[PDB]
Design brief:
- The complex is a heterotrimer of chains A (10), B (99) and C (274).
- By secondary structure, chain A is low in regular secondary structure.
- In chain A, 0% of the residues lie in helices and 0% in strands.
- Chain A contains no helices and no strands.
- The termini of chain A are far apart.
- Chain B starts with 5 loop residues before the first strand and ends in a 5-residue tail after the last strand.
- Chain C has two domains: 181 residues, Murine Class I Major Histocompatibility Complex, H2-DB, Chain A, domain 1; 91 residues, Immunoglobulins (Immunoglobulin-like), CATH 2.60.40.10.
- In chain C, β13 and β14 form a beta hairpin.
- The two termini of chain C are 35 Å apart.
- The chains are: A little secondary structure (10), B mainly beta (99), C alpha+beta (274).
- Chain B: One of its GO terms (molecular function) is structural molecule activity.
Chain lengths: 10, 99, 274
């Protein structure tokens, strides 16, 4: 299961 | 930031003529990710090649496996044809059933 | 034994040929089990192992949605990096990410991971304390200001200490038969005459899992470290791996060389010879 933190913006 | 790909052309199981097998072309340690890969049978391109989803190693370099099912014979020749920014011309690696 | 779960993200820009592409693959140890490619027309997360297939639709839709949002996010990160560095939009660029957890035999967490590479070089990484960041250069320090402001570390930490570990434990249970197995390498040696004076001895290891393996050439008790040619370990396409080592020896002296193989599926190292 992936982390649902799909808005990790660099 | 540029790494020329390493190319290996082999079969999944040991080549036995008249027997169903898989011809693999493993491409590794390359950067960037844009690459062109063809399996060749007697100099001509094979239609039914599939391939794995792009992944990479710890050093960030890329690898991909291309492969098609096939039945080797005493006479039929095989190869893998790879092009990439680091290659001036497509590199062809003939299948040698001893490596 | 000791196990790991890992995700690998890659976004590559392709100027004048579309919006940047985004792929994700999932691994449990050396086993691919899941995949995503934003080029597929209706991009979806797809199983690549028998034991993830039982997972329900709530799972597959959640995962797909994660993947889809990352696609957009990575496109934006590429744009931001290009601006930091004052790079041309004519140039191709790559952003990668590996993250996941390592555990030991008790199921305990030993290490959490989350680092990025821009154009194949480390960019920013989450440190082992899962609290601090290591930034490669001034551009990355900008990124770090962003990740600190958004308290990204702590949320990552929580994921790596709880959910990631729980998913791996579950996968290990569901696919225990094949994930806890150690497939020992099948072995043999081949001979190839070079000249009048020498030939090649190749030692082979096939059908082994997991990938970690050690091939050595000896004569007749000492290792030819400097003279052994190794190929990168390669997948056979059937969940198993292949690898060989070769030595150039003088014609007539083949008899004094032995090949030795070490693999966790082998209680004792194997000796082989021509």
């Amino acid at each position: 299961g992936e982390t649902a933190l799909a808005l990790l913006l660099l | 930031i540029q790494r020329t790909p390493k190319i290996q052309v082999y079969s999944r199981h040991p080549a036995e003529n008249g027997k169903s097998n898989f011809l693999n072309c493993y491409v590794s340690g390359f950067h960037p990710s844009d690459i062109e890969v063809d399996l060749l049978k007697n100099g001509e391109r094979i239609e039914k090649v599939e391939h794995s989803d792009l992944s990479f190693s710890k050093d960030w370099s890329f690898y991909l496996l291309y492969y098609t099912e096939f039945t080797p014979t005493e006479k039929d020749e095989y190869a893998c044809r790879v092009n990439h920014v680091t290659l001036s011309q497509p590199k062809i690696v003939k299948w040698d059933r001893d490596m | 034994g000791s196990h790991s779960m890992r995700y690998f993200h890659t976004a590559m820009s392709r100027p004048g040929r579309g919006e940047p592409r985004f792929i994700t693959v999932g691994y449990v140890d050396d086993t691919l089990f899941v995949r995503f490619d934003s080029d597929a027309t209706s991009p979806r997360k797809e199983p690549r192992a028998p034991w993830i297939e039982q997972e329900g639709p709530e799972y597959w839709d959640r995962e797909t949605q994660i993947s889809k949002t990352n696609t957009q996010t990575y496109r934006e990160s590429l744009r931001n990096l290009r601006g930091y560095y004052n790079q041309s939009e004519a140039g191709s660029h790559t952003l990668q990410r590996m993250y996941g957890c390592d555990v030991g035999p008790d199921g305990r967490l030993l290490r959490g991971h989350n680092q990025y590479a821009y154009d194949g070089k480390d960019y920013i990484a989450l440190n082992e304390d899962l609290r601090s960041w290591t930034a490669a250069d001034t551009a990355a320090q900008i990124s770090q200001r962003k990740l600190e402001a958004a308290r990204v570390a702590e949320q990552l930490r929580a994921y790596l200490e709880g959910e990631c570990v729980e998913w791996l434990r579950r996968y290990l249970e569901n696919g225990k038969d094949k994930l806890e197995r150690a497939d020992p390498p099948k072995t043999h040696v081949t001979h190839h005459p070079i000249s009048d004076h020498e030939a090649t001895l190749r030692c082979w290891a096939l059908g082994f899992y997991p990938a970690e393996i050690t091939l050595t050439w000896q004569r007749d008790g000492e290792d030819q470290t400097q003279d052994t040619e190794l190929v990168e370990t390669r997948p056979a396409g059937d969940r198993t791996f292949q690898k060989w080592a070769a030595v150039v020896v003088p014609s007539g002296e083949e008899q004094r060389y032995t090949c030795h193989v070490q693999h966790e599926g082998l209680p004792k190292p194997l000796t082989l010879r021509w």
